[PDB]
Design a protein around this ligand. Structure first.
Ligand SMILES: NC(=O)c1ccc[n+]([C@@H]2O[C@H](COP(=O)([O-])OP(=O)(O)OC[C@H]3O[C@@H](n4cnc5c(N)ncnc54)[C@H](OP(=O)(O)O)[C@@H]3O)[C@@H](O)[C@H]2O)c1
Length: 331
């Protein structure tokens, strides 16, 4: 009787938080995974309202055809699967193509075989809206209208620029598909910054230590003689990203929208100060730097007012998000 929701890349960090949230709202879920045992693991963790299908390669035409044919009860599709790595041999084969062609072929499969799908949400990224130097700029104001100027030729040259390109061009292709093919579904994208926060299941706190979360987790591996990490940027809590995905398919207002998911700026000093205050027993094992020397008052606030009005909830603050990540890891 209830609606089923399809989530590509269900093994992932964001994807599992999305899955745990939608299951809690009464939805069923069907998740895609690159292998059978990967499916089997998730089933044990999430229970009866979760099914999976093995889709090993995104960059094949009709890759999701069989999976979708087997699940007519699915009316919602959340495409989150994407290479999220900066380190590869071929930027193209390992990052650009599976993102760009993966995305094109999923939308085509939905149109071909799942005409009952009314909503599709694509997980994009702030990298689709800018170039590396602009993000760390204090005179740059990003908005839902922002598009990266990074060219495809330049995106190939190395790993970080490939990831920037992958998101920008996959998302473009997504909006171009909607314009050109005129599908039954309405499209919306979620564009987050660095994603922090606890993993969905404690049992998953062991391997595949995902890039973004690890930027918090790595602090615990410092020792008192190490330098303050130089990591800096803007954050959003994984649980807020999940709620945005939910709003991205439940709210009429979210149709045809890009949603910029960005909260506050932080650097390595912000991180150490939070961890040191909340986990005093680790203070002797950690560097000190210059507590509260961090100052972001010169940075123009990004324009996410539209996203904030559509979402209609308040975000987890940096300390809570970081605190909950470390709590779980220590547990
Ligand atoms: N976390 C961030 O820093 C961040 C920020 C903004 C936007 N995003 C976007 O949101 C998504 C979720 O982020 P995340 O932190 O959850 O990343 P993640 O933990 O690395 O999740 C990636 C998932 O997608 C699948 N996948 C990756 N590369 C693939 C490929 N070449 N072919 C087929 N499947 C592949 C993997 O499935 P298997 O487990 O089966 O390999 C993996 O579980 C990302 O795709 C990213 O584009 C992420």
């Amino acid at each position: 009787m209830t609606t089923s929701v399809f989530v590509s890349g269900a093994t992932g960090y964001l994807a599992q938080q999305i899955i745990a949230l939608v299951l809690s709202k009464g939805y069923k879920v069907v998740g895609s995974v690159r292998s059978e045992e990967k499916g089997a693991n998730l089933k044990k963790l999430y229970g009866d309202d979760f099914s999976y299908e093995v889709v090993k390669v995104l960059e094949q035409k009709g890759a999701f055809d069989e999976a979708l044919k087997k699940h007519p009860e699915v009316t919602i599709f959340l495409h989150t699967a994407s290479p999220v790595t900066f380190e590869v041999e071929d930027t193209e084969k390992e990052i650009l193509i599976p993102a760009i062609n993966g995305t094109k072929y999923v939308l085509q499969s939905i149109k071909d075989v799942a005409p009952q799908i009314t909503r599709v949400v694509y997980t994009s990224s702030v990298v689709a809206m800018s170039v590396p130097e602009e993000l760390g700029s204090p005179d740059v104001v990003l908005s839902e209208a922002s598009w990266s100027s990074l060219s495809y030729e330049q995106s190939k040259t190395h790993g970080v620029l490939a990831y920037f390109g992958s998101k920008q061009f996959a998302e473009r292709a997504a909006w171009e598909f909607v314009e050109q093919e005129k599908p039954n579904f309405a499209l919306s994208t979620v564009n987050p910054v660095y994603i922090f926060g606890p993993q969905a299941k404690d049992e998953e706190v062991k391997g595949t230590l995902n890039l973004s979360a690890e930027m918090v987790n790595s602090v615990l591996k410092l020792n008192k003689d190490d330098d303050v990490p130089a990591t800096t940027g803007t954050f959003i809590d994984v649980r807020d990203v999940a709620k945005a995905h939910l709003a991205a398919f439940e709210k009429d207002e979210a149709k045809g929208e890009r949603l910029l998911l960005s909260n506050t700026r932080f650097n390595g000093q912000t991180l150490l100060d939070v961890v040191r205050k909340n986990f005093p027993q680790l203070a002797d094992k950690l560097p000190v730097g210059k507590p509260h020397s961090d100052d972001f008052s010169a940075f123009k606030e990004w324009n996410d007012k539209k996203t904030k009005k559509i979402l209609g909830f308040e975000y987890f603050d940096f300390e809570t998000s970081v605190v909950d990540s470390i709590k779980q890891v220590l547990k």
